[PDB]
Amino acid sequence: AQTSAVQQKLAALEKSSGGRLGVALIDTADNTQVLYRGDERFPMCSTSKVMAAAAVLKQSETQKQLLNQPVEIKPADLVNYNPIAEKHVNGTMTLAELSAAALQYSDNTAMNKLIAQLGGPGGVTAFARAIGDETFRLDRTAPTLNTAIPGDPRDTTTPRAMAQTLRQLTLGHALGETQRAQLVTWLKGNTTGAASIRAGLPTSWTVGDKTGSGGYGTTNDIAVIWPQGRAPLVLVTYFTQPQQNAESRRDVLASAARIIAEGL
Ligand SMILES: *C(=O)[C@@H](NC(=O)/C(=N\OC(C)(C)C(=O)O)c1csc(N)n1)[C@@H]1N=C(C(=O)O)C(=C)CS1
Known about the structure:
five-stranded antiparallel β-sheet; alpha+beta; globular; metal-binding; binds acylated ceftazidime; Beta-lactam_class-A_AS; monomer; Beta-lactamase; 36% helix
């Protein structure tokens, strides 16, 4: 009933933003979906870290000690943003610590260690395919996976595919029960999300999310949302701009989430 209005409002937000906006909502109360450019490709940037962390969690289902396995951090492993890993240079971090740093602080060195643990970007993609995601592709390590060049298929997915995958990982059965709970705990402990999807939602709703930022002013967020009194929602908001040096626009993601919420 409200869906025509939501579509109109998302288009008006996009027009005022100057950029290109992609939205996918799944309401798990009734499997309703609301999409805006839901089948167009967008650069994932650091939102791809959810897939990498989940792939390591899947490996840990058959290796009970895997998350405690130490990984060496060398000075040469530091990249453009690595607030956790830099404390451990010439030392080690466990795979659990790398997963938490990648997800909750968006540490790019930590993401690179997860990618390497999976055999490279193609190993992350192979895990995506194993859980039914035919759209996701990871092609590069950080920081270059965040270049976000328009038209480049590398390191992209669609909002529809990412919402479905995030649902399967956090609420469905793609991971074992303990691993699903650990992923949800990590996402709920994210430090980077208060200005993005969360900022558009009622403060009483619990959120776990993973943000992303990259070239072309790319500003992304993927979230699982537990509204008050309601089954959870999954929401992807992806946003990218026409000039390489464009500024971040987390407010656009908040505005998209607000429009989605007001139409529930
Ligand atoms: C994931 O998206 C990561 N993004 C980046 O490394 C890039 N830019 O992000 C920062 C450094 C925050 C920025 O100035 O926008 C990047 C790599 S190559 C390029 N042109 N830009 C991490 N993502 C986030 C996040 O938004 O979640 C961070 C907070 C840390 S970097």
